[PDB]
Amino acid sequence: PMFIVNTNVPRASVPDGFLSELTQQLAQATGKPPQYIAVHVVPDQLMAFGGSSEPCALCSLHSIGKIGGAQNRSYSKLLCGLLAERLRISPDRVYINYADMNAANVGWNNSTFA
Amino acid sequence: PMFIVNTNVPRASVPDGFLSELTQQLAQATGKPPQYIAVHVVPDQLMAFGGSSEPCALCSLHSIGKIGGAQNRSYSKLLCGLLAERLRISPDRVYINYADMNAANVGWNNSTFA
Amino acid sequence: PMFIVNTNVPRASVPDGFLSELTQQLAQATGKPPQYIAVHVVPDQLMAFGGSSEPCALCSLHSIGKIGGAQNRSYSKLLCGLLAERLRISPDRVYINYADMNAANVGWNNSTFA
């Protein structure tokens, strides 16, 4: 899985340990081994949500499987919870694009997962 | 809807008011309320388009519906127009990826739009 | 085609000529003219792969066609090779998301490619 968070929250407001926390919580929620989880946080961004520049986040979660209606609801509760708690971003100012990737469409280690 | 623009144009060349203009015009084009429109501009990027580095933009528009042949032509005219007028980027150095998202695959406010 | 590389490797480690090399190699690999190839490198990112902050890369290749099982294995060998050689990133710390775009869903030059 690959989880990307883009936010206008400044770098100094991203707490130490945030990437590890994301990694651990995602391994668990998705059921995948931690070794396959990639995380990326991009602070200080020029962005708006609903016209407003109050704290917000634009995110994505790509994964080979483990994407679906109920699963995505559960990821959203988790991720929004973490963004609220750690970055002080309101959940209603978060968007997460979920994408179910075909194994043939993910390159890794000189090949793909197909 | 979520609109992202990645560009090599420098931050000081992004005019005041640009995120609001993008929010307004995308609300109108998509028919969605401005409160649901998110915009993100990423200047000063290391990028090339067709081998050169004159001003260019790599963008995406993710929307739940309102994506299709004619609509996307219309979004491209609008968005290329705005990038040309405000960031001085030639339309033939703009790429926009359009993604029609299923409501179950967009997280927001601790759940999805399903 | 559009190729994007997000990496924690620092900007100074990205060699001069890397965008042109990517452009040329992708033109050859995809068979598309270099005028249609866009490349974007984002260094100094806050990211982790497998919980580790050792060098890694999160990438994507969007193309109208020329995406598939065998092709993507080949692109992954090529791309991982280049990231290892030029950025010193281990291939098993690289993810590449491949997306086969419909021509109607790519905006360019005030219209789409449809």
From Swiss-Prot, chains A, B, C:
Protein name as it appears in the record: Macrophage migration inhibitory factor
Entry superkingdom: Eukaryota
Entry-annotated residues carrying N6-acetyllysine: K77
Clinical disorder: Rheumatoid arthritis systemic juvenile: An inflammatory articular disorder with systemic onset beginning before the age of 16. It represents a subgroup of juvenile arthritis associated with severe extraarticular features and occasionally fatal complications. During active phases of the disorder, patients display a typical daily spiking fever, an evanescent macular rash, lymphadenopathy, hepatosplenomegaly, serositis, myalgia and arthritis.
Positions of the catalytic residues: P1 (proton acceptor)
Catalysed reactions listed for this entry: 3-phenylpyruvate = enol-phenylpyruvate; L-dopachrome = 5,6-dihydroxyindole-2-carboxylate
Pfam family, one: MIF
GO biological process terms, semicolon-separated: carboxylic acid metabolic process; cell surface receptor signaling pathway; cellular senescence; DNA damage response, signal transduction by p53 class mediator; inflammatory response; innate immune response; negative regulation of apoptotic process; negative regulation of cell migration
EC number of this enzyme: 5.3.2.1, 5.3.3.12
PROSITE patterns: MIF
Main subcellular location: secreted
Subcellular location: Secreted; Cytoplasm
Consequence of changing N110C: Causes formation of interchain disulfide bonds with Cys-80 from another subunit
Gene: MIF
Gene induction: Up-regulated in concanavalin-A-treated lymphocytes. Up-regulated in macrophages upon exposure to M.tuberculosis antigens.
